[PDB]
Amino acid sequence: XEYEYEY
Amino acid sequence: XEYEYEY
Amino acid sequence: XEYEYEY
Amino acid sequence: XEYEYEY
Amino acid sequence: XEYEYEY
Amino acid sequence: XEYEYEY
Amino acid sequence: XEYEYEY
Amino acid sequence: XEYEYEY
Amino acid sequence: XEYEYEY
Amino acid sequence: XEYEYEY
Amino acid sequence: XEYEYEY
Amino acid sequence: XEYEYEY
Amino acid sequence: XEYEYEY
Amino acid sequence: XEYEYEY
Amino acid sequence: XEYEYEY
Amino acid sequence: XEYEYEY
Amino acid sequence: XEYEYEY
Amino acid sequence: XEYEYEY
Amino acid sequence: XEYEYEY
Amino acid sequence: XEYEYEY
Amino acid sequence: XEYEYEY
Amino acid sequence: XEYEYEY
Amino acid sequence: XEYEYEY
Amino acid sequence: XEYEYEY
Amino acid sequence: XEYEYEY
Amino acid sequence: XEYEYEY
Amino acid sequence: XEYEYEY
Amino acid sequence: XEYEYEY
Amino acid sequence: XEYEYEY
Amino acid sequence: XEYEYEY
Amino acid sequence: XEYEYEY
Amino acid sequence: XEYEYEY
Amino acid sequence: XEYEYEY
Amino acid sequence: XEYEYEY
Amino acid sequence: XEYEYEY
Amino acid sequence: XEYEYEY
Amino acid sequence: XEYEYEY
Amino acid sequence: XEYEYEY
Amino acid sequence: XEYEYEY
Amino acid sequence: XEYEYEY
Amino acid sequence: XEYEYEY
Amino acid sequence: XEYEYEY
Amino acid sequence: XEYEYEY
Amino acid sequence: XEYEYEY
Amino acid sequence: XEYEYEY
Amino acid sequence: XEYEYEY
Amino acid sequence: XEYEYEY
Amino acid sequence: XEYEYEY
Amino acid sequence: XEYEYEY
Amino acid sequence: XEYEYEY
Amino acid sequence: XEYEYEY
Amino acid sequence: XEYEYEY
Amino acid sequence: XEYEYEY
Amino acid sequence: XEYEYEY
Amino acid sequence: XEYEYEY
Amino acid sequence: XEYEYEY
Amino acid sequence: XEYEYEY
Amino acid sequence: XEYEYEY
Amino acid sequence: XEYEYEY
Amino acid sequence: XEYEYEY
Amino acid sequence: XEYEYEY
Amino acid sequence: XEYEYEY
Amino acid sequence: XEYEYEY
Amino acid sequence: XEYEYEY
Amino acid sequence: XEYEYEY
Amino acid sequence: XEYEYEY
Amino acid sequence: XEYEYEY
Amino acid sequence: XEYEYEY
Amino acid sequence: XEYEYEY
Amino acid sequence: XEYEYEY
Amino acid sequence: XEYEYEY
Amino acid sequence: XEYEYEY
Amino acid sequence: XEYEYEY
Amino acid sequence: XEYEYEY
Amino acid sequence: XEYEYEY
Amino acid sequence: XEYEYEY
Amino acid sequence: XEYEYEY
Amino acid sequence: XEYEYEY
Amino acid sequence: XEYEYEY
Amino acid sequence: XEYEYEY
Amino acid sequence: XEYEYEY
Amino acid sequence: XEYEYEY
Amino acid sequence: XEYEYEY
Amino acid sequence: XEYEYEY
Amino acid sequence: XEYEYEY
Amino acid sequence: XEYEYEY
Amino acid sequence: XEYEYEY
Amino acid sequence: XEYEYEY
Amino acid sequence: XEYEYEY
Amino acid sequence: XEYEYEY
Amino acid sequence: XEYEYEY
Amino acid sequence: XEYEYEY
Amino acid sequence: XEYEYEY
Amino acid sequence: XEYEYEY
Amino acid sequence: XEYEYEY
Amino acid sequence: XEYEYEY
Amino acid sequence: XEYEYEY
Amino acid sequence: XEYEYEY
Amino acid sequence: XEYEYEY
Amino acid sequence: XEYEYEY
Amino acid sequence: XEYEYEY
Amino acid sequence: XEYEYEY
Amino acid sequence: XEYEYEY
Amino acid sequence: XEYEYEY
Amino acid sequence: XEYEYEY
Amino acid sequence: XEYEYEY
Amino acid sequence: XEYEYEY
Amino acid sequence: XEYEYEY
Amino acid sequence: XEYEYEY
Amino acid sequence: XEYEYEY
Amino acid sequence: XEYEYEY
Amino acid sequence: XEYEYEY
Amino acid sequence: XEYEYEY
Amino acid sequence: XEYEYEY
Amino acid sequence: XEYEYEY
Amino acid sequence: XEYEYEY
Amino acid sequence: XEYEYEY
Amino acid sequence: XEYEYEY
Amino acid sequence: XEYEYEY
Amino acid sequence: XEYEYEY
Amino acid sequence: XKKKKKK
Amino acid sequence: XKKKKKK
Amino acid sequence: XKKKKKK
Amino acid sequence: XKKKKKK
Amino acid sequence: XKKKKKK
Amino acid sequence: XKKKKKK
Amino acid sequence: XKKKKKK
Amino acid sequence: XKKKKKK
Amino acid sequence: XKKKKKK
Amino acid sequence: XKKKKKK
Amino acid sequence: XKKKKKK
Amino acid sequence: XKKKKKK
Amino acid sequence: XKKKKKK
Amino acid sequence: XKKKKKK
Amino acid sequence: XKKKKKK
Amino acid sequence: XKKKKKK
Amino acid sequence: XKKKKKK
Amino acid sequence: XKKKKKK
Amino acid sequence: XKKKKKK
Amino acid sequence: XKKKKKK
Amino acid sequence: XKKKKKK
Amino acid sequence: XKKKKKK
Amino acid sequence: XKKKKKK
Amino acid sequence: XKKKKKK
Amino acid sequence: XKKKKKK
Amino acid sequence: XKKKKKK
Amino acid sequence: XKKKKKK
Amino acid sequence: XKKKKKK
Amino acid sequence: XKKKKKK
Amino acid sequence: XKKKKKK
Amino acid sequence: XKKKKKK
Amino acid sequence: XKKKKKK
Amino acid sequence: XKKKKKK
Amino acid sequence: XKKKKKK
Amino acid sequence: XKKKKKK
Amino acid sequence: XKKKKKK
Amino acid sequence: XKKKKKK
Amino acid sequence: XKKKKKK
Amino acid sequence: XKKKKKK
Amino acid sequence: XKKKKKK
Amino acid sequence: XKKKKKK
Amino acid sequence: XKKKKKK
Amino acid sequence: XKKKKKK
Amino acid sequence: XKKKKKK
Amino acid sequence: XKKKKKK
Amino acid sequence: XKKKKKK
Amino acid sequence: XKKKKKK
Amino acid sequence: XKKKKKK
Amino acid sequence: XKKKKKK
Amino acid sequence: XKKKKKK
Amino acid sequence: XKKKKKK
Amino acid sequence: XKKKKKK
Amino acid sequence: XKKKKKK
Amino acid sequence: XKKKKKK
Amino acid sequence: XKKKKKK
Amino acid sequence: XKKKKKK
Amino acid sequence: XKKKKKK
Amino acid sequence: XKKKKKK
Amino acid sequence: XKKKKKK
Amino acid sequence: XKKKKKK
Amino acid sequence: XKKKKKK
Amino acid sequence: XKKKKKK
Amino acid sequence: XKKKKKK
Amino acid sequence: XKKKKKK
Amino acid sequence: XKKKKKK
Amino acid sequence: XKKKKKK
Amino acid sequence: XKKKKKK
Amino acid sequence: XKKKKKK
Amino acid sequence: XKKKKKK
Amino acid sequence: XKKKKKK
Amino acid sequence: XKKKKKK
Amino acid sequence: XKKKKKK
Amino acid sequence: XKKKKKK
Amino acid sequence: XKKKKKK
Amino acid sequence: XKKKKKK
Amino acid sequence: XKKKKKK
Amino acid sequence: XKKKKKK
Amino acid sequence: XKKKKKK
Amino acid sequence: XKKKKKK
Amino acid sequence: XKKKKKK
Amino acid sequence: XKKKKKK
Amino acid sequence: XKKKKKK
Amino acid sequence: XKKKKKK
Amino acid sequence: XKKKKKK
Amino acid sequence: XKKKKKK
Amino acid sequence: XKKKKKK
Amino acid sequence: XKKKKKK
Amino acid sequence: XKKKKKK
Amino acid sequence: XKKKKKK
Amino acid sequence: XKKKKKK
Amino acid sequence: XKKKKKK
Amino acid sequence: XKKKKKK
Amino acid sequence: XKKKKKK
Amino acid sequence: XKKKKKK
Amino acid sequence: XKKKKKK
Amino acid sequence: XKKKKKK
Amino acid sequence: XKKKKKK
Amino acid sequence: XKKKKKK
Amino acid sequence: XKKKKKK
Amino acid sequence: XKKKKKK
Amino acid sequence: XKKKKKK
Amino acid sequence: XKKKKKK
Amino acid sequence: XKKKKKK
Amino acid sequence: XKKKKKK
Amino acid sequence: XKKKKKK
Amino acid sequence: XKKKKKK
Amino acid sequence: XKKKKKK
Amino acid sequence: XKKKKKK
Amino acid sequence: XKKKKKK
Amino acid sequence: XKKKKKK
Amino acid sequence: XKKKKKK
Amino acid sequence: XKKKKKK
Amino acid sequence: XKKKKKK
Amino acid sequence: XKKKKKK
Amino acid sequence: XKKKKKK
Amino acid sequence: XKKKKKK
Amino acid sequence: XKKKKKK
Amino acid sequence: XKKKKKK
Amino acid sequence: XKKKKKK
Amino acid sequence: XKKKKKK
C-alpha cells in the first residue's frame, strides 16, 4: 501493496 | 492494495 | 482496493 | 473497491 | 464498489 | 455499487 | 446500485 | 437502483 | 427503481 | 418504479 | 409505477 | 400507474 | 391508472 | 382509469 | 373511467 | 364512465 | 355514462 | 346515459 | 337517457 | 328518454 | 319520451 | 311522449 | 302523446 | 293525443 | 284527441 | 275529438 | 266531435 | 258533432 | 249535430 | 240538427 | 231540424 | 223542421 | 214545419 | 205547416 | 196550414 | 510492498 | 519491500 | 528490501 | 538488503 | 547487504 | 556486505 | 565484507 | 575483508 | 584481509 | 593480510 | 602478512 | 612476513 | 621475514 | 630473515 | 639471516 | 648469517 | 658467518 | 667465519 | 676463520 | 685461521 | 694459522 | 703457523 | 712455524 | 722452525 | 731450526 | 198571428 | 207569429 | 217567430 | 226566431 | 235564432 | 244562433 | 253560434 | 263558435 | 272556436 | 281554437 | 290552438 | 299550439 | 308547440 | 317545441 | 327543442 | 336540443 | 345538444 | 354535445 | 363532447 | 372530448 | 381527449 | 390524450 | 398522452 | 407519453 | 416516454 | 425513456 | 434510457 | 443507459 | 452504461 | 461501462 | 469499464 | 478496466 | 487493468 | 496490470 | 504487472 | 513484474 | 522481476 | 531478478 | 539475481 | 548473483 | 557470485 | 565467488 | 574464490 | 583462493 | 592459495 | 600457498 | 609454501 | 618452503 | 626449506 | 635447509 | 644445511 | 653443514 | 662440517 | 670438520 | 679436522 | 688434525 | 697433528 | 706431530 | 715429533 | 723427536 | 192545433 | 201544436 | 210543439 | 219542442 | 228541444 | 237540447 | 246539449 | 256538452 | 265538454 | 274537457 | 283536459 | 292535461 | 302535463 | 311534465 | 320533467 | 330533468 | 339532470 | 348531471 | 358530473 | 367530474 | 376529475 | 386528477 | 395527478 | 405526479 | 414525480 | 423524481 | 433522481 | 442521482 | 452520483 | 461518483 | 470517484 | 480515485 | 489513485 | 498511486 | 508509486 | 517507487 | 526505487 | 535503487 | 545501488 | 554498489 | 563496489 | 572493490 | 581490490 | 590488491 | 599485492 | 608482492 | 617479493 | 626476494 | 635472495 | 644469496 | 653466497 | 662463498 | 670459500 | 679456501 | 688453503 | 697449504 | 705446506 | 714442508 | 723439510 | 731435511 | 204575409 | 213572410 | 222569410 | 231566411 | 240562412 | 249559413 | 258556415 | 266553416 | 275549417 | 284546419 | 293542420 | 301539422 | 310536424 | 319532425 | 327529427 | 336525429 | 345522432 | 353518434 | 362515436 | 370512438 | 379509441 | 388505443 | 396502446 | 405499449 | 413496452 | 422493455 | 430490458 | 439487461 | 448485464 | 456482467 | 465479470 | 473477473 | 482475476 | 491472479 | 499470483 | 508468486 | 517466489 | 525464492 | 534463496 | 543461499 | 552459502 | 561458505 | 569456508 | 578455511 | 587454514 | 596453517 | 605452520 | 614451523 | 623450526 | 632449529 | 641448531 | 651447534 | 660446536 | 669445539 | 678445541 | 687444543 | 697443545 | 706443547 | 715442549 | 725441551 502516509 | 492516509 | 482517508 | 473517508 | 463517507 | 453517506 | 444516505 | 434516504 | 424516503 | 415516502 | 405515500 | 395515498 | 386514496 | 376514494 | 367514492 | 358513490 | 348513487 | 339513484 | 330513481 | 320512478 | 311512475 | 302512471 | 293513468 | 284513464 | 275513460 | 266514457 | 257514453 | 249515449 | 240516444 | 231517440 | 222519436 | 214520432 | 205522427 | 197524423 | 188526419 | 512516509 | 521515509 | 531514509 | 541513508 | 550512508 | 560511508 | 570510507 | 579508507 | 589506506 | 598505506 | 608503505 | 617500504 | 627498504 | 636495503 | 645493503 | 655490502 | 664487502 | 673483501 | 682480501 | 691477501 | 700473501 | 709469501 | 718465501 | 727461501 | 736457502 | 204595422 | 213593421 | 222591421 | 232588420 | 241586420 | 250583419 | 260580419 | 269577418 | 278573418 | 287570418 | 296566418 | 305563418 | 314559418 | 323555418 | 332551418 | 341547419 | 349542419 | 358538420 | 367534421 | 375529422 | 384525423 | 392520425 | 401516427 | 409511428 | 418507430 | 426502432 | 434498435 | 443493437 | 451489440 | 459485443 | 467481446 | 476476449 | 484472452 | 492469455 | 500465459 | 509461463 | 517458466 | 525454470 | 533451474 | 542448478 | 550445483 | 558442487 | 567440491 | 575437495 | 584435500 | 592433504 | 601431508 | 609429513 | 618428517 | 626426521 | 635425525 | 644424530 | 652423534 | 661422538 | 670422542 | 679421545 | 688421549 | 697421553 | 706421556 | 715421560 | 181534456 | 190535459 | 200536463 | 209537466 | 218537470 | 228538473 | 237539475 | 247541478 | 256542480 | 266543482 | 276544484 | 286545486 | 295546487 | 305547488 | 315548489 | 325549490 | 335550491 | 345550491 | 355551491 | 365551491 | 375551491 | 385552490 | 394551490 | 404551489 | 414551488 | 424550488 | 434549487 | 444548485 | 454547484 | 463546483 | 473544482 | 483542480 | 492540479 | 502537478 | 512535476 | 521532475 | 530529474 | 540526473 | 549522472 | 558519471 | 567515470 | 576511469 | 585507469 | 594502468 | 603498468 | 612493468 | 621488468 | 629483468 | 638478469 | 647473469 | 655468470 | 663463471 | 672458472 | 680453474 | 688447476 | 697442478 | 705437480 | 713432482 | 721427485 | 729422488 | 208587385 | 217582385 | 226577385 | 234572385 | 243567386 | 251562386 | 260557387 | 268552389 | 276547390 | 285542392 | 293536394 | 301531396 | 309526398 | 317521401 | 326516403 | 334511406 | 342506409 | 350501413 | 358496416 | 366492420 | 374488424 | 382483428 | 390479432 | 398475437 | 406472441 | 414468446 | 422465451 | 430462456 | 438459461 | 447456466 | 455454471 | 463452476 | 471450481 | 480448486 | 488447491 | 497445496 | 505444501 | 514443506 | 523443510 | 531442515 | 540442520 | 549442524 | 558442529 | 567442533 | 576442537 | 585443541 | 595444544 | 604444548 | 613445551 | 623446554 | 632447557 | 642448560 | 651449562 | 661450564 | 671451566 | 680453568 | 690454570 | 700455571 | 710456572 | 720457573 500500500501507499502509506501516516501524517 | 490500498491508498492510505492516516491523517 | 481501497482509497482510504482516516481523517 | 471502495472510496473510504472515515471523517 | 462503494463511495463511503462515514461522517 | 453504492454511494454511501452514514451521516 | 444505490444512493444511500443514512441520516 | 434506489435513491435511499433513511432519515 | 425506487425513490425511497423512510422518514 | 416507485416514488416511495414511508412517512 | 407508482407514487406512494404511506402516511 | 397509480397515485397512492394510504392515509 | 388510478388516483387512490385509502383514507 | 379511476379516481378512487375508499373513505 | 370512473369517479369512485366508496363512502 | 361513471360517477360512482356507493354510500 | 352514468351518474350512480347506490344509497 | 343515466342518472341513477338506487335508494 | 334516463332519470332513474329505484326508490 | 325517460323520467323513471320505480316507487 | 316518457314520464314514468310505476307506483 | 307519454305521461305514465301505472298506479 | 298521451296522459296515461292505468289505475 | 289522448287523456287516458283505464280505471 | 280524445278524453278517454275506460271505466 | 271525442269525450269518451266506456262505462 | 262527439260526446260519447257507451253505457 | 254529436251527443251520443248508447245506453 | 245531433242529440243521440240509442236506448 | 236533430234530437234523436231510437227507443 | 227535427225532433225524432223512433219508438 | 219537424216533430217526428214514428210510433 | 210539421207535427208528424206516423202511428 | 201541417199537423199530420197518418193513423 | 193544414190539420191532417189520414185515418 | 509498501510506499511508506511516516511524516 | 518497502520505500521508507521516516521524516 | 528496503529503501530507507531516516531523515 | 537495504538502501540506508541516516541523514 | 546494505548501502549505508551515515551522513 | 556493506557499502559504508560514514560521512 | 565491507567497502568502508570513514570520511 | 574490508576496503578501508580512513580519509 | 584488508585494503587499508590511512590517508 | 593487509595492504597498508599509511600516507 | 602485510604490504606496508609508510609513505 | 612483510613487504616494508619506509619511504 | 621481511622485505625492507628504508628509503 | 630479512632483505634489507638501507638506501 | 639477512641480505644487507647499506647503500 | 649475513650477506653484507657496505657500499 | 658473513659475506662482507666493504666497498 | 667471514668472507671479507675490504675493497 | 676468515677469507681476507685487503684489496 | 685466515686466508690473507694484502694486495 | 694463516695463509699470507703480502703481494 | 703461517704460509708466508712476501712477494 | 713458518713457510717463508721472501721473493 | 722455518722453511726459508730468500729468493 | 731452519731450512735456509739464500738463493 | 198577426200582421202588424205600427205606423 | 207576427209580421211586424214598427215604422 | 217574427218578421221584424224596426224602420 | 226572428227575422230582424233594425234599419 | 235570429237573422240580424243592424243596418 | 244568429246570422249577424252589423252593416 | 254566430255568423258575424262586422262590415 | 263563431264565423267572424271583421271587414 | 272561431273562424276569424280580420280583413 | 281559432282559424286566424290577419289579412 | 290556433291556425295563424299573419299575411 | 299554433300553426304560424308570418308571411 | 308551434309550427313556425317566418317567410 | 317548435318547427322553425326562417325562410 | 326545436327543428331549425335558417334557410 | 335542437336540429340545426344553417343553410 | 344539438345536431348542427352549417352548410 | 353536439353533432357538428361544418360543410 | 362533440362529433366534429370540418369538411 | 371530441371526435375530430379535419377532412 | 380527442380522436383526431387530420386527413 | 389524443388519438392522432396526421394522414 | 398521445397515440401518434404521422402517416 | 406517446405512441409514435412516423411511417 | 415514448414508443418510437421511425419506419 | 424511449423504445426506439429506427427501421 | 433507451431501448435502441437501429435496424 | 441504453440497450443498443446496431443491427 | 450501455448494452452494445454491433451486429 | 459498457457490455460490448462487436459481432 | 467494459465487457468486451470482439467476436 | 476491461474484460477482453479477442475471439 | 485488463482481463485479456487473445483466443 | 493485466491477466494475459495468448492462447 | 502481468499474469502471462503464452500457451 | 510478471508471472510468465511460456508453455 | 519475473517468475519465469519456459516449459 | 528472476525465478527461472527452463524445464 | 536469479534463481536458475535448468532442468 | 545466481542460484544455479544445472540438473 | 554464484551457488552452483552441476548435478 | 562461487559455491561449486560438481556432483 | 571458490568453494569447490568435485564429488 | 579456493577450498578444494576432490572427493 | 588453496585448501586442498585430494581424498 | 597451499594446505595439501593427499589422503 | 605448502603444508603437505601425504597420508 | 614446505611443511612435509610423508606419513 | 623444508620441515620434513618421513614417518 | 631442511629439518629432517627420518623416523 | 640440515638438521638430521635418523631415528 | 649438518646436525647429524644417527640414533 | 658436521655435528655428528652416532648414538 | 666434524664434531664426532661415536657413543 | 675433527673433534673425536670414541666413547 | 684431530682432537682424539679414545675413552 | 693430533691431540691424543688413549684413556 | 702428536700430543700423546696413553693414560 | 711427539709429546709422549705413557702414564 | 720426542718428549718422552715413561711415568 | 188541439186541446184534449181527457178526464 | 197541442195541450194534453190528461187527468 | 206540445204541453203534456200528465196528472 | 215540448213541456212534460209529469206530476 | 224539451222541459221535463218531473215531480 | 233539454232541461230535466228532476225533483 | 242539457241541464240536469237533479234535486 | 252538459251541466249536472247534482244537489 | 261538462260542468259537474256536485254539492 | 270538464269542470268538477266537488263541494 | 280538466279542472278539479276539490273543496 | 289538468288543474287539481285540492283544498 | 298538470298543476297540483295542493293546499 | 308537472308543477307541484305543495303548500 | 317537474317543478316541486315545496313550501 | 327537475327543479326542487325546497323552502 | 336537476337543480336543488335547498334553502 | 346536478346543481346543489345548498344555502 | 355536479356543482355543489355549499354556502 | 365536480366543482365544490365550499364557502 | 374535481375543482375544490375551498374558501 | 384535481385542483385544490385552498384559500 | 394534482395542483395544490395552497395560499 | 403533483404541483404544490405552497405560498 | 413533483414540483414543490415552496415560497 | 422532483424539483424543489425552495425560495 | 432531484433538482434542489435552494435559493 | 441529484443537482444541488445551492445559491 | 451528484452535482453540487455550491455558490 | 460527484462533481463539487465549489465557488 | 470525484472532481473537486475548488475555485 | 479523484481530480482536485485547486485554483 | 489522484491528480492534484494545484495552481 | 498520484500525479502532483504543483505549479 | 507518484509523479511530482514540481514547477 | 517515484519520478521527481523538479524544475 | 526513484528518478530525480533535478534541473 | 535511484537515478539522479542532476543537471 | 545508484546512477549519479552529475552534469 | 554505484556509477558516478561525473562530467 | 563502484565505477567512477570521472571526465 | 572499484574502477576509477580517470580521464 | 581496484583498477586505476589513469589517463 | 590493484592494477595501476598509468598512461 | 599490485601491477604497475607504468607507460 | 608486485609487478612493475616500467616501460 | 617483486618483478621489475625495467625496459 | 626479486627478479630484476633490466633491459 | 635475487636474480639480476642485466642485459 | 644472488644470481647475476650479467650479459 | 652468489653466482656471477659474467659473459 | 661464490662461483665466478667469468667467460 | 670460491670457485673461479676463468675461461 | 679456493679453486682456480684457470683455462 | 687452494687448488690452482692452471692449464 | 696448496696444490699447483701446473700443466 | 704444498704439492707442485709441474708437468 | 713440499712435494715437487717435477716431470 | 721436502721431497723432490725429479723425473 | 730432504729426499732428492733424482731419476 | 204580402205580394208587392212594384212596377 | 213576402214576395217583392221589384221590376 | 222573403223572395226578392229584383229585376 | 231569404232568396235574392238579383238579375 | 240565404240564397244569393247574383246573376 | 248561405249559398252565394255568383255568376 | 257558406258555399261560394264563384263562377 | 266554408266551401269555395272557385271556377 | 275550409275546402278550397280552386280550379 | 283546410283542404286546398289546387288544380 | 292542412292538406295541399297541389296538382 | 300538414300533408303536401305535390304531384 | 309534415309529410311531403313529392312525386 | 317530417317524412320526405321524395320519389 | 326526419325520415328521408329518397328514391 | 334522422334516417336517410337513400336508395 | 343518424342512420344512413345507403343502398 | 351514427350508423353507416353502406351496402 | 360510429358504426361503419361497410359491405 | 368507432367500429369499422369492413367486410 | 377503435375496433377494426377487417375481414 | 385500438383492436385490429385482421382476419 | 393496441391489440393486433393478426390471423 | 402493444400485444401482437401473430398467428 | 410489447408482447410478441409469435406462433 | 419486451416479451418475445417465440414458439 | 427483454425476455426471449425462445421455444 | 435480458433473459434468454433458450429451450 | 444477461441470464442465458441455455437448455 | 452475465450468468450462463449452460445445461 | 461472469458466472459460467457449465453442467 | 469470473467463476467457472465446471461440473 | 478467476475461480475455477473444476469438479 | 486465480484460485484453481481442482478436485 | 495463484492458489492451486490440487486434491 | 504461488501456493501449491498439492494433496 | 512459492510455497509448495506437498503432502 | 521458495518454501518446500515436503511432508 | 530456499527453505526445504523435508520431514 | 538455503536452509535444509532435514528431519 | 547454506545451513544443513541434519537431524 | 556453510554450517553443518550434524546431530 | 565452514563450521562442522558434529555432535 | 574451517572449524571442526567434533564432540 | 583450520581449528579442530576435538573433544 | 592449524590449531589442534585435542582434549 | 601449527599449534598442537594436546591436553 | 610448530608449537607442541604437550601437557 | 619448533617449540616443544613438554610439561 | 628447536627449543625443548622439558619440564 | 637447539636449546635444551632441561629442568 | 647447541645450548644444554641442564639444571 | 656446544655450550653445556651443567648446573 | 665446546664450553663446559661445569658448576 | 674446548674450555672446561670446572668450578 | 684446550683451556682447563680448574678452580 | 693446552693451558692448565690449576688454582 | 703446554702451559701449567700451577698455583 | 712446556712451561711449568709452579708457584 | 722445558722451562721450569719453580718459585
Author numbering:
A (entry chain C), B (entry chain C), C (entry chain C), D (entry chain C), E (entry chain C), F (entry chain C), ...: 1 to 7
Recite the paper's sentences.
We selected KKKKKK as the positively charged intrinsically disordered peptide, a sequence found as a disordered region in proteins36−38 like KRas. We selected EYEYEY as the main negatively charged peptide for interacting with KKKKKK due to its presence in human proteins, such as MAP3K5, albeit without an experimentally verified ordered structure. Improved filament separation at pH 10 allowed for detailed imaging, showing a homogeneous, single type of cross-β filament with a diameter of ∼50 Å. Testing all possible indexed symmetries established that the nanofiber has C2 symmetry, with a helical rise of 4.68 Å and a twist of −4.22°, featuring parallel cross-β packing and six hydrophobic pyrene rings in the core. The nanofiber’s asymmetric subunit (ASU) contains three peptide copies: one Pyn-KKKKKK (1), one Pyn-EYEYEY (2), and a third with only an ordered pyrene ring. The remaining residues of the third peptide were flexible and disordered, revealing a disorder-to-order continuum and demonstrating unexpected conformational heterogeneity in heterotypic intrinsically disordered peptide nanofibers. Moreover, analysis of the atomic model revealed multiple hydrogen bonds between tyrosine and lysine, and we have seen side-chain densities from the cryo-EM map to support those side-chain conformations. K1 forms three intermolecular hydrogen bonds with Y2 and Y4 from the same peptide and Y2 from another peptide, and tyrosine also forms an intramolecular hydrogen bond between Y2 and Y4. The conformationally disordered Pyn-EYEYEY and Y6 from the ordered Pyn-EYEYEY should allow hydrogen bonding with additional Pyn-KKKKKK, which explains the postassembly bundle formation. To verify this, we also synthesized Pyn-EFEFEF to interact with Pyn-KKKKKK and found that postassembly addition of Pyn-KKKKKK was unable to form well-defined bundles.
